[PDB]
């Protein structure tokens, strides 16, 4: 007896091509999260940060999207990032720059 | 009635069957729809980037330390009372040359620091 995690058919056959070791690590991680659901918001963030970090070095701390260059990351932060809520802790702000500052200072995610 | 060697687990539409005990089974269907969504999103990310499984021990030790204190060292993941005591540790006491995440090696622990910030995005003053 157990639970079904509603993954797509591709991801399901992809899943079963992983090694038992990778597979028990995965279900060990979901068990940690079931026991500690307060952990979900933040591990979701970090797993997505590290995911984006694999695509490019230049990642946005608020939206977690990879960019080609530091110039384009700067241009996105300058005109295209309007998140007023820190994705890890959900603290709300008056400014996206303040949100950027908070994520760096409190959470260690800096550009 | 059981059928252990059945191969329809491979093509089930409900998806990945994670076997679980009675306590956490009920505790799973006690989660909000939003929490269940996050669990799926993480599992999907882990499926598409399986090297994050090898970095997971670090991630959950980071989070555990961050709960004890805001001031944590990226190389050893140990909490400190203040920022002043944290950078006393980094300046004088932290000697690891290996990145706790990717296992790449360096000349100085300061090069190890810059690396963990530049390519893993975990940064400290
Ligand atoms: Zn962004
Ligand atoms: Zn926050
Ligand atoms: Zn340390
Ligand atoms: Zn590394």
Curated annotation (Swiss-Prot), chain B:
Coiled coil: none annotated. One of its GO terms (molecular function) is zinc ion binding. Keywords: Metal-binding, Repeat, Zinc, Zinc-finger. SMART domains: ZnF_C2H2. The keyword Zinc-finger applies. Gene3D superfamilies: 6.20.390.10, Classic Zinc Finger. InterPro entries: B129_C2H2-Znf, ZN622/Rei1/Reh1_Znf-C2H2, Znf_C2H2_sf, Znf_C2H2_type. A zinc finger (C2H2-type) spans 71-95, 97-120. The keyword Zinc applies. This is Uncharacterized protein B-129.
């Amino acid at each position: 007896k157990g639970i079904f995690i509603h993954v797509t058919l591709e991801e399901l056959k992809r899943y079963h091509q992983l090694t038992p070791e990778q597979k028990r690590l995965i279900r060990a991680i979901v068990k940690t999260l079931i026991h500690n659901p307060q952990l979900l918001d933040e591990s979701s963030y970090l797993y997505r940060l590290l995911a984006s970090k694999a695509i490019s070095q230049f990642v946005c701390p608020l939206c977690l999207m990879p960019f080609s260059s530091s110039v384009s990351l700067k241009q996105h932060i300058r005109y295209t990032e309007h998140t007023k809520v820190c994705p890890v802790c959900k603290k709300e702000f008056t400014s996206t720059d303040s949100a950027l500052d908070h994520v760096c200072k409190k959470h260690n995610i800096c550009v």
